[PDB]
Homo-oligomer: A and B are copies of this chain.
Amino acid sequence: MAKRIQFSATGGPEVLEYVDFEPKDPAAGEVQVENKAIGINYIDTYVRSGLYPAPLPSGLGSEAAGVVTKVGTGVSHIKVGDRVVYAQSSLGAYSEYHNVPAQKVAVLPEGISFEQAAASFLKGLTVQYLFRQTHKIKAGDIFLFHAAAGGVGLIASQWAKALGAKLIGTVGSDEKAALAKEAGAWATINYQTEDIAARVAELTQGEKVSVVYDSVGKSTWLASLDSLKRHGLLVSFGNASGPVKDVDLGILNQKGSLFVTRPSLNGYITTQEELAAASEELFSLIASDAIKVDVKDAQKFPLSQARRAHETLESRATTGSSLLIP
C-alpha cells in the first residue's frame, strides 16, 4: 500500500484527496517508479478543474522522477534501481509509486538529482521542441517569450542564451525581471506596466520578431500578433489567462500573413527515439551548466500538501518550477 493524490470531483484545490492505494506490478511494456520528486505543471490544475476531461476518481500529474523498483516483461534498456524521470505518464505522477511505459522514461545522468529532473523535464522537453522543432532558433535571433520568470521561462531564457539568441521575456514584476535577465534573457518587459507589442517594436528598432512563444493565450493574443514581423510565427502552447477562442483567420492576414500553431508536448514527442533525442539535449545542457535548474524551498510541498501547492501555483506568486515530495 502507498499514497497518492486524487480527486473525486472536479473543482478548485480543495477537491484534492490524499489516499491509500495498492500499486500494481508493471505490465509487459512498463517499469514501476518509486517517485522521489514530482513535477507540478499548470495542466495539473486544468485537469483537476475539469477543463480537460478525465475519468473519476482520477490521479494527477504526468511528470515525476525516482527510482525504478520493478520492471515488466519486455524491458531491456531500463533495469531495477535505475534513477529515472518521465514527463508523459498516465495521470497519476502525484503518487509514491506509478507505472510508466519504458518507452516514455529517460535514465538520468549521475549529475542530475531527482528534484532537478522533476523541476526541469517536462518543462525542458517543452523548451526543446519549441526552440529546435516547432521553429529552429538561430544564433542572433530576436524573439518574444511570454512568462519568462516561470518554470518554462527560465529554462527558455538559459536555452536561448546557449543558442546565442536574444529572448525578450515578459514578466509580472521587477524582481522577476532581474531573475529572467540573470537566466540569460536578452531583454525584459513588464506585462503590467508596459505595452508588450510597443516595447517589442522599440527593442527591435521597428523590425519586430519572426517568432513568439505565448503560454498566456487570451490576454496576449493581440499583443503577440502585433509583436510579429511579416510571415512571423505565433506559437501558442499554453492558456494561462484562458484559451484563445473566436479567432477569424483573416486576422492572420491583417497582421502580415502570419503563421500560428498550437503545439503540445504529446504532439512532438511520440516515440522513445524522439524522447531519447530530446532528453539527451536537455540533460546535455543541464550537465554542462548551460541550463541550471533550481527550486526555491518555499515551492517544495510534501505530497500530502498537494492542495496547498496548487493554491500557490494559481495565485502566480511563484517563480520557476514547483515540486511535490512523496
Interface residue ranges, A against B (CB under 8 Å): 134, 217, 230-231, 233, 236, 243-253, 256-264, 267-268, 270
Contacts and interface: CB of A to CB of B under 8 A. Distances in A.
Given A246-B246, A247-B247, A261 B252 contact: yes
A253 B230 contact: no
Given A256-B267, A268-B257, A249 B262 contact: yes
B247 A262 contact: no
Contact of A253 (B245, B247, B253, B267): B267
Contacts of A246: 245-248
Contacts of A236: 249
Contacts of A217: 249
A249 B260 contact: yes
Contacts of A253: 262-264, 267
A298 B230 CA distance: 40
Q: Which 3 A-B pairs give the minimum distances between C-beta atoms?
A: A257-B267, A252-B262, A257-B263
Given A257-B263, A257-B267, A248 B252 contact: no
Contact of A259 (B230, B231, B243, B260): B260
18 contacts: A134-B257, A230-B270, A243-B248, A245-B246, A245-B247, A245-B248, A249-B262, A252-B261, A253-B263, A253-B264, A256-B267, A257-B262, A257-B268, A258-B261, A259-B259, A259-B260, A259-B261, A260-B260
B247 A243 contact: no
Contacts of A259: 233, 259-261
A243 B248 CA distance: 8
B243 A262 contact: no
A287 to B, nearest CB: 28
Contacts of A256: 267
Contacts of A243: 248-250
A208 to B, nearest CB: 14
A89 to B, nearest CB: 19
A257 B249 contact: no
Interface core residue of A134, A245, A261, A268 (most chain B CB under 10 Å): A261
Contact of A248 (B244, B257, B261, B267): B244
Contacts of A258: 261-262
Nearest to A236: B249
